[PDB]
Every structure is written in C-alpha cells, then in structure tokens.
C-alpha cells in the first residue's frame, strides 16, 4: 500500500473524535489539543484557528492526551510520545504489552496508567531537563485495594503524591517512594469522572447516577453531594473567575451549571452535543475567564461565554444565561459526495449522510462553512409547504457545479435520495437556490448535469426521461425520451453541441443539441453505472457493469479503450485534468491508475478502508478521495 | 468600540462627582420635596437639621430608628463624602442604606419619611448609586404622588425600562405597566432576592405583600400559554412560595397559599411536588386564618392533579401530620360548610389513608360519605379498600355498617367489585 | 487534623532560591533550604493567594415533617410538568396532532 504516484497529505474536516481534549495555557493565552484518531490538532483557544497538526500519523489511535506549556503528550497503543510544535521529541515505550489508558504529569513525574491496573512513573534525569525520561518505578493496584483505575490527578501542594481515583475509592500514593499512604471509604456507586477544584484539598467525583461528590482528601470525608437524578455524568469543571460555579456535563448532552455559594441551579444547556455520539465528552472552564469549551464526538467544538449581570448592585443573584461564543465543526456521519468547486483548487463541496452539505477549504481551515438551507419566498405569491418542525434535505447523492455564472443565478444542482426533484443551490451566497427541478414522469433523479455556459441544467430520471431546464429562470425547456430503464449519466460538450447519455439498458445515446436530432445510438454489453466526461479532448469513460471501464471518443462515436483488471464493482473514478490517466476505485478496496495511451494499469494502491469517491483537482495538484468510515476527506499529492 | 462610547461609559462611572460649579448645581438641585431653585440655594447643614427633626418623629412612631441616628445621621455624616472612600467603606455604606430602606419602606405615606429620606437622597445620592433598592422598596405605592416624585428624580436602571417610558409625567404608571415589568424574567429573579432579604429581616406588611401577590398571579396568567415560559418560571415562584411559607406571619402564609393555588391550576404539576407542597404548608401552619386558607388550598391542589396515581393514599408521615393539624371534626365542619368547595379527590385520598393507616374511625368514614357526594371510581376504590380490610381484619360492626351503606347506595357496584374479588 | 501522615515529606529538605517562581516563598533574606513541612505550608498559602478561598468549601457542609421539602424536590426534578403518568385525560388548550 505504498504507491508510486500519490502520497498522502492530510485529512480535512475533522475537529474532534471524542477523546477528551486537553488544554494548555501558554503564557497569558490558551490552546486546545484535540485528537482525531491518529493525529492531534492544536487550536488557538481565543479564535479557534488551526495552529498545528501532528507531524506523522501515529501507529494506532490515541488513547490519552495531556498538555503542558510547550509540550503535548499523546499516549497511543503502548507508548507515550512527547511532541513540541507538532514534531516528535521523545518516544517513551512502557515495558508491557497492555494499552495505556490514562496519563497525568506533575512536576518531575510523568505517570502513565495501563489497563491492567498498573502505574508507570517516569522521572526527569535532572530538573534542568524539560520532560521526563528515566524509568523510576511501577506502582500497581491489587484488586483488594480498589477496582479498576479511572483517573490520575495531582491536587495542589501535595508533595510527591498522586491521587488515583478508582472505580470504588480514591487512593493516595507517595510516588517518590510509593507507599500507599491513604485509602478512601468505598463509594456506593461507580465513580465515572474526577476533577480537582480550585479550593484546596478537594476533588469532585462524578458518579454514574447523577451524583457529584465533593470529597475532601486531607480529612478524607465528603463535604458535599449534589444529585442530578437519571443522568450519566461525564464532565466536571469549576468556574474560577471568582464566581463559584460548576458545570456538570452529562452524557446526554445537557450541560448543567450550579452555583455553589447559593446552592442553586443556574442553568441547563440542552442538546449541545448529540446523545448518540457520546454527549459531552469534555467541558472546561478556561482558567480565569467566563469561557467554557465543550467538545463532543459528533465532530464539533464549541465555546460558550457568560455575560455579566444586568443589575447594578444585586449582582450575582441575577445571573445571565450563558450564550454561545464560537465554534468549528465537520460532518457527524461519513461523507457521501465530494466535488471541487473551483479551478484554483480552493473550496470543496461535500455532502454527508447527516444530510448536511459543507464547503471545505483546503488552504485555511477556518474558511470552511456549512451551506445553509433557508428557503426563499415562493415566487408565485403562495405558500411553500412542509412540516413546520424543520429537518435537513435528503442525502445528496449526485452533484454538479459550474463556475461560469457565479453571482447571477444559481450554479449547483443536487440530487437527493428517494426524492423526485433536484435542488439548485448557490455557491456565492452559500444557500439553497430558488429553484427546484422536477423530473415529470415520477422517477427518482438518478443523475444530473450542468452546461458549460451555466444556463441549462439536465436532470436524468429513473424512468428514462431527460428534462432540461433554464437555471436563470428555473423554467422547463426541453425533454427528450430515448432510454427506457434508468438514466445514469448525462453530459454536454463545451461547444454546447453534442449531448451524451448513458443508461442501464446498456445504451449510450448521442444527441445533437443546437437542433434536436438524434445523432447515434451505441449499444454495450452490460448496464452502465457511471459516466465521466472529459471536455477539452472529447473523451469519456463509462464504468460498465461487468467490472470494466470503457473509454469512448465522443466525436467519432466508437469505443476506443477497454480497461479490464478490476475484480468487484467500480465505485468511482475520474479523468486526469490533462486527459491522460484514470483513477478508479473499486469495492475490492483498491484504487488503480490507468494510462490511456498505453491503455493499461500503471499504478495500484490497496486500501484498508474502501474508497467511495475519487476526484482530481482541476488544477492538477491533488487527488481527494473519500472513504467508507471516518468523517473526513483524504488528500493526496501528485508526484507526477 | 468607539471613543465616543468608551467616553460615555467613563461619564457613567464618574456620574456623581461635582467637577464643576455647573454640574454641582445640577446634582444638588435634584431633590424630593423642594423645587429646583430653592433646593439648589440651600446647603447641607440646613437639610440635616430638617432631617434630624423628622427622624426624631419617626423614632417616636417606630422605635428602630435610633440606631440610624447613631450611625448615618450624625454630624460626622454631615462631613463624610461618598466618592472619597475606598470600596470596603462604600460597601458598608450601602449596607446601611439598604437596611434603612427596608425598615422604612412601610411608612411612605408619611411626611417624616419624606424628610429623612430626603437627607439620604441629597447627601448620599441614593437616587444615583443604589436606585434598585430604592425602587424595589418604594415600588408598591405606584399611584401616590411620592412615587411619581421618585421616578422624576431617579435614572432608571437596566431592568426598569417600562417606567423608563413613564418617567417625568403627570399621569402615573398603570397596572399593565407593572405587570409587564414583572413579565420579563430577570426582574423576577431580582425581586425574589429582595423578598428573601425582606423576609429574613422581618419587615413585611399587608400592603406590599398583596402587591407582590397580585403581580405573581398576573405573571402566571399572562404566561398561561407559553408552556416553556411556564415551565421555566416554576422554580422561582416555587422558591418564593417555600420561603414565604417558612416565615411566621399569617399574611406571608396566606400569600404563599394563593400563589400555590394559581400556579398549580395553571400548570399540571407532578404528584411528588404537590405532596411536598402539602408537607411544607402543614408543617409550618399555625394561625386560624391560615388554617382555613390552607384547607381550601390543599383541596384545590389535589383536585388539580389527574392521571394515574390519581386518588392514592397519603404516605404515613403526611397523613399523621394532617391529623395533628386538623381534627376530623374540623374536616367535618369544613364538609358541613354551605359553599362546599369541590374536594372529592382529597376526601377520598384521605379516606383511603384512614382505612389503611388507622383502621378505627370507620364511623367517621360513614360520616364523611354521608356528607359528600363522591364519584363512581372513588366509590370503587374505597369499596375495594374495605374489601381487603375485611379480609385482613375481623368482620367488625362498623365495617359491616359501611357495607350496608353501600348496599343502600349501589348494590350493583358492590356486586361488580365482588366479582372482581369474591362472591 | 488530617487522616494520614507522610514520614518522608517531613524528613525531606528542599531548596528555594534556585527558581524564580518560588524565590518569593521565603520569610528572611537568609533562608535558602527549607524542610518539607514548611515548604508545604508556604506553598498552601501561596495557593490561597492565587485562588482565594470561598464560602462553599469552608463555611458550608452537608453534615414532625420538615420545612425544606418543596425547595429540595425542586432541586431534584428538572422538568416539572407531569407527563410520564399515562394521564388518561386529554389536557386542555394545546392539541397534539400529527399529519399522516
């Protein structure tokens, strides 16, 4: 799976996967280290731009993250990697064969905790070093001392001590020697989170029912308990501006703020992160500010603030609700269709299976936006009618764009799923365009196309018909009928001259278009599954059904090349920008590059995760593919 | 943001410092009694003489005010300034101003209060510095020329914009203005804090407790549609209802009663919450007036809840509590009342609780069923409870007596519930 | 008083002046090495000076029929309209209707 033309670059449109992110002050300012599978990305916490990206993809996923001033520690499969500015500065392999769950760094010591209840301690060689490397010792949790380890903490002012919160009790170790100096009495629930408070001695433990226990460690006794009934607590953070507040983040998405001076409940925030993909996995108050940063496995990262009171003297009895400062995101579900918008290879449309169409940016990953669906006022003087509780359009399964009239009328056509028209979208304003394009014989739109000049949009259906519509006016112009089974690809020449359509009855029909004659009818073996046309050279490629690619010269109207060699069905494929190669990805998890002069395969990559779209950039620097699992787009360079 | 707007907020900070002779006549000529020119001609020593006389009059009427003569109304208080003092000192001066405004909110139809608080207005600028406590104190007089005056001087805070429209006018503010003040929400939080402080320092009276009642009623009425607004206004009124109950003034307790009644008939509250409502009500019930009102209230709450669990027993503790507070002859004369509030659901919940927890007053049970006209499913529940009681107990004479009462009325239902269990 | 005691934490001996961040712990201009107990007490007071001590930690702990009950169950429950009860009676003025 080493290749000879394409090499992998990065994976656009991922923000978090649900490992609890880590934060790091740097001076007066804050950064946010999130991990995306096998990488970690670092965001300016004030304005959320993408500062850094982990340099090489780690061998497995990242289990734990922690950060400090300039350094950030990721604990993947067995090892701990210390990175500074992204680049790997120390490896640290733990002498075992069991994965590293948790990780806490305090002073001289790094503390890693495996899954078979053991604690490895790595100590700095001399405190003029900047991160620890000597193996020190290995503290272990025998099952009579506690359950499984849940987290590692180090409370303030505790000299050489480590607070190990297990599933039944809290232990205190004296990590320099390592004698278990203290055990707590067994909690009658399961402990799920722990987090240290900005008061002394006190760790806040969140159990599996709605119960947060403020537990005082020097005395060893609980001082408070707080009951949410019927929630699963999954985050705890202590607002430290000076107002004594708490944010418990449940594992249903609620984020509930308590006021601990007045024993009240300030607020709730409901569905800020999705119930299915995990809820609120981390939710932290930045140290010193009225700002909370929350992040969840639905690929999104959010920031909420507190405005001050409206009332002059009464002050902190009138608490303003916390509103929404800023955020990034991506798709929740894996993507469905991608297409380069423009011919500088800047922007990329991509529709995803949570029905949402993002437009990503390849240069700066703050320019990426979601294309909104807020309909226009119907042009007839009537009422547009849908369910009043709103939901996103059905999954966008074909998509075709032209940049030739951008700004004056719409220029995307999308074809949704189990739905009988297409929707014109915009790209300048980034919004649903004002026309919807029917098919006029009750047949689900199976494929769409747009003219070069940007005036006309063809909508092939699934009962054979072809309808052609003006896009400035959304108004129906022509309608051919030649196929009888489904119509799976449409195309038009750059001189607005010859139209090609390929349909499951194994027919490629060629039409003239200025006048309306039928110019030819070619018949193949099998059903025809996809058409890609290539314009400058008038050649196109039909992915047939019998596991073959057939290249046809759209002028002399005959089959010029026949590329065999695949083994399962062909998912998607694309001509080069210069007309010379085909990249084609097929359901046996391969991607092959074919040369059309010599008519034969010149490259092939075997992929661990099936590729389901493949698209060159138009200015031919990159190849963007997209895969069956994992929310992103994988970007590849071009050694040619 | 602009230089203009940052300068504006600077001027708001230094809003009470006399930097000029012109500004000083502006500040000093705002006053509660006099007109502008006369007020700006006279000086602090004269205003203090008038104020000390008036506070001696108020000390005669109400004897708490000698402490203020010790600490805010002295010759030293002629001398002090408000802007030359560090923040700890300012906080204490605002504690004393807030406690004064409480302990003479209740006398604001009196020229002595006009004169004494006029010294506080002029020497300490309460009409600029702590206006929210000024307005929340003297709020309920909203027709008396005194409140029209206080509006005319004050500069309205961010939560009193309705009056911000009505300021400087010969017409007064109107009832619908007061309801729309309260129908915003963060004001309800603010006012609740003012009432907690008022309760805890024990200065309440029928006039203002009526006014706060009438506004909490009217807020629930206007929000009677938007169920999200209602559901989010539950904790604030029910916090006040609890604290206002936990007080010891019968007026407080009657106000809390009427708040609970209106709120539960506007929103269907959960069973556990109506149970705890009853728990607090009874557990601090003493007075005669409150006893009558509380009885009406509990009957109305239980009539409101409807679903499953509709007509069950009270738990042991609440039942025993109710018996301590209320005699069966008292509930019997209540059922002997002429007007007869609809109380069937509470009556049968009480009856099932008797027959499952006391097992003696079955003569009283027959008395109750003679008194009131229950409904068919209440009959069914009571008769089945008695059937189980018979099968656990000796077939006693009074249990028999109850049975032939039902035989007098509905042999057939006795037969139907018997077919459910028995012969 | 506490519920554990650390023999090495008292017998240890720590320097101060070697680091800017902790030169400010000293009481004299002479001391350079303190033992662990006084280091930990200085350090606790500095933590106090960073994050000042509130009321909720310190002044308040959790420790016929009551009075607090209405407020307590309000604290517990979060959505107070009874819905979950199979209400059997169609509630008034807001209809619940779905188009098929």
């Amino acid at each position: 799976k080493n290749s000879k033309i394409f090499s992998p670059f990065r994976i656009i449109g991922n923000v978090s996967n649900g490992v609890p992110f880590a934060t790091g002050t740097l001076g007066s300012t804050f950064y946010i280290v999130t991990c995306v599978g096998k990488t970690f990305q670092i965001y300016d916490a004030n304005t959320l731009h993408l500062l850094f990206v982990s340099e090489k993809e780690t061998p497995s996923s990242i289990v734990a993250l922690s950060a400090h001033f300039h350094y950030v520690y990721a604990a993947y499969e067995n090892k701990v990697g210390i990175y500074k500015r992204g680049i790997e500065e120390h490896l640290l392999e733990l002498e075992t064969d069991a994965n590293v769950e948790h990780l806490c760094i305090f002073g001289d010591y790094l503390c890693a905790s495996t899954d078979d209840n053991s604690i490895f301690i790595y100590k700095k060689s001399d405190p003029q070093d900047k991160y620890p490397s000597e193996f020190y010792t290995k503290l272990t949790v025998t099952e009579i001392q506690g359950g499984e380890i849940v987290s590692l903490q180090h409370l303030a002012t505790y000299l050489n001590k480590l607070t190990v919160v297990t599933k039944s009790n809290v232990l205190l170790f004296n990590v320099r020697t390592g004698k278990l100096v203290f055990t707590s009495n067994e909690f009658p629930d399961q402990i799920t989170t722990a987090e240290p408070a900005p008061v002394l001695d006190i760790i806040a433990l969140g159990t599996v029912t709605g119960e947060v226990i403020m537990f005082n460690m020097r005395k060893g006794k609980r001082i408070r308990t707080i009951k949410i009934p019927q929630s699963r607590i999954s985050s705890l953070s202590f607002r430290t501006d000076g107002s004594s507040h708490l944010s418990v983040g449940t594992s249903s998405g609620d984020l509930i703020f308590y006021d601990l001076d007045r024993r009240s409940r300030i607020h709730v925030l409901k569905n800020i992160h999705r119930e299915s993909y995990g809820g609120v996995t981390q939710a932290t108050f930045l140290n010193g500010q009225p700002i909370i940063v929350t992040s969840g496995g639905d690929n999104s990262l959010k920031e909420y603030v507190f405005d001050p009171s409206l009332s002059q003297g009464s002050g902190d009895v009138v608490v303003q609700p916390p509103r929404y400062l800023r955020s990034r995101g991506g798709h929740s579900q894996p993507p469905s269709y991608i297409a380069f918008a423009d011919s500088q290879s800047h922007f990329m449309l991509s529709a995803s299976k949570d029905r949402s169409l993002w437009s990503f940016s390849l240069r700066k990953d703050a320019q990426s936006q979601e294309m909104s669906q807020r309909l226009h006022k119907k042009q007839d003087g009537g009422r547009v009618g849908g369910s009043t509780i709103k939901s996103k359009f059905p999954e966008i399964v074909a998509l075709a764009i032209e940049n030739a009239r951008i700004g004056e009328w719409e220029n995307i056509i999308t074809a949704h799923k189990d739905e009988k028209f297409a929707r014109t979208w915009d790209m300048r304003n980034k919004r649903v365009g004002r026309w919807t394009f029917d098919t006029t014989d009750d047949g689900f739109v199976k494929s769409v196309a747009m003219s070069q000049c940007g005036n006309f949009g063809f909508i092939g259906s699934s009962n054979g018909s072809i309808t052609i519509y003006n896009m400035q006016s959304g108004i129906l112009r022509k309608k051919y009928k030649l196929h009888k089974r489904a119509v799976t690809g449409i195309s038009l020449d750059g001189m607005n001259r010859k139209m090609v359509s390929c349909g499951l009855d194994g027919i490629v029909g060629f039409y003239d278009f200025n006048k309306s004659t039928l110019l030819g009818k070619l018949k193949l073996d099998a059903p025809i599954t996809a058409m890609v046309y290539h314009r400058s050279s008038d050649l196109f490629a039909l992915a047939l059904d019998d596991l073959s690619i057939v290249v046809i010269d759209a002028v002399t109207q005959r089959v010029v090349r026949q590329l065999w060699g695949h083994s399962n069905r062909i998912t998607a494929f694309d001509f080069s920008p210069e007309g010379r190669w085909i990249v084609s990805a097929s359901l046996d998890s391969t991607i092959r590059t074919w040369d059309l002069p010599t008519g034969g395969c010149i490259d092939g990559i075997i992929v661990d995760n099936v590729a389901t779209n493949v698209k060159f950039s138009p200015n031919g620097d990159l190849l963007a593919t997209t895969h069956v699992t994992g929310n992103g787009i994988c970007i590849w360079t071009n050694r040619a | 943001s602009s230089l203009s707007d940052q300068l504006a907020q600077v001027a708001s900070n230094n809003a009470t410092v006399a930097l000029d002779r012109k500004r000083r006549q502006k500040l000093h000529s705002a006053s509660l009694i006099y007109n502008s020119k006369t007020a700006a001609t006279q000086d602090y020593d004269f205003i203090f003489e008038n104020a000390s006389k008036a506070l001696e009059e108020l000390s005669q009427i109400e004897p708490k005010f000698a402490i203020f003569s010790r600490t805010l109304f002295s010759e030293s208080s002629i001398s002090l300034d408000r802007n030359v003092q560090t923040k700890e000192e300012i906080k204490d001066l605002d504690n004393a101003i807030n406690a004064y405004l409480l302990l003479a909110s209740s006398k604001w139809y009196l020229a002595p209060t006009l004169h004494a608080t006029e010294w506080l207005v002029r020497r300490f600028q309460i009409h600029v510095k702590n206006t929210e406590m000024l307005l929340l104190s003297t709020l309920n007089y909203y027709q008396t020329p005194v409140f029209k005056r206080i509006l005319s001087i004050i500069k309205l805070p961010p939560l009193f914009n309705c009056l911000s429209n009505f300021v400087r006018s010969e017409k007064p503010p109107t009832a619908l203005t007061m309801i729309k003040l309260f129908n915003d929400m963060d004001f309800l939080k603010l006012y609740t804090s003012y009432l907690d402080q008022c309760i805890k320092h024990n200065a309440t009276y029928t006039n203002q407790l009526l006014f706060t009642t009438c506004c909490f009623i009217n807020v629930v009425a206007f929000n009677s549609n938007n169920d999200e607004k209602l559901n989010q206004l539950v904790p604030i009124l029910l916090e006040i209802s609890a604290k206002l109950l936990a007080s010891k003034s019968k007026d407080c307790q009657i106000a809390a009663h009427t708040i609970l009644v209106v709120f539960a008939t506007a929103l269907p509250l959960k069973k556990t919450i109506i149970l705890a409502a009853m728990e607090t009500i009874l557990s601090n019930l003493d007075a005669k007036e409150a006893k009558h009102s509380a009885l009406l209230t509990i009957c109305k709450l239980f009539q409101t809840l409807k679903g499953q669990g509709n007509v069950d027993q009270l738990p042991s503790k609440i039942f025993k509590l109710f018996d301590s507070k209320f005699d069966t002859v008292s509930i019997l004369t209540f059922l002997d009342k002429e007007d007869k509030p609809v109380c069937d659901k509470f009556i049968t919940s009480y009856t099932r609780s008797i027959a499952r927890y006391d097992r003696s007053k079955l003569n009283i049970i027959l008395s109750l069923l003679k008194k009131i006209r229950l409904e068919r499913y209440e009959v069914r529940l009571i008769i089945t409870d008695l059937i189980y009681l018979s099968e656990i107990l000796e077939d006693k004479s009074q249990l028999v007596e109850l049975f032939e009462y039902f035989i007098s009325i509905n042999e057939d239902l006795v037969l139907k519930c018997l077919k459910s269990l028995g012969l | 008083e506490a519920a554990w005691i650390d023999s090495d934490d008292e017998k240890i001996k720590v320097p101060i002046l070697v680091t800017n961040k902790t030169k400010k712990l000293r009481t004299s201009y002479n001391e350079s090495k303190i033992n662990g107990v006084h280091y930990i007490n200085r350090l606790r007071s500095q933590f106090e000076k960073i994050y000042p001590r509130p009321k909720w930690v310190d002044d308040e702990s959790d420790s016929n029929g009551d009075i607090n009950a209405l407020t307590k169950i309000l604290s517990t429950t979060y959505n107070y309209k009874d819905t979950l009860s199979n209400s059997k009676l169609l509630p008034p003025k807001k209809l619940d209707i779905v188009r098929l």
Binding site: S28, T29, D108, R176, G288, Q289 | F187 | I12, V14
Partner: peptide, 28 residues
C-alpha cells in the same frame, strides 16, 4: 419598551495558575 439584551464583546483577561512543576520535590 422591554428590556434590551445585547451581547458585548468578550475579551480574555488573564489569571494566574498554580504549578505542579514546583509541587514535586527531591530527597537528600
């Protein structure tokens, strides 16, 4: 008129923080 609710630009003032990397110490 009703009450105005308008959001003001939030800017991040700084605050101190403790240190573990002092918190641990060394034997003799």
């Amino acid at each position: 008129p009703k009450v105005v609710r308008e959001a003001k630009k939030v800017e991040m003032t700084e605050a101190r923080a403790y240190n573990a990397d002092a918190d641990t110490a060394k034997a003799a």
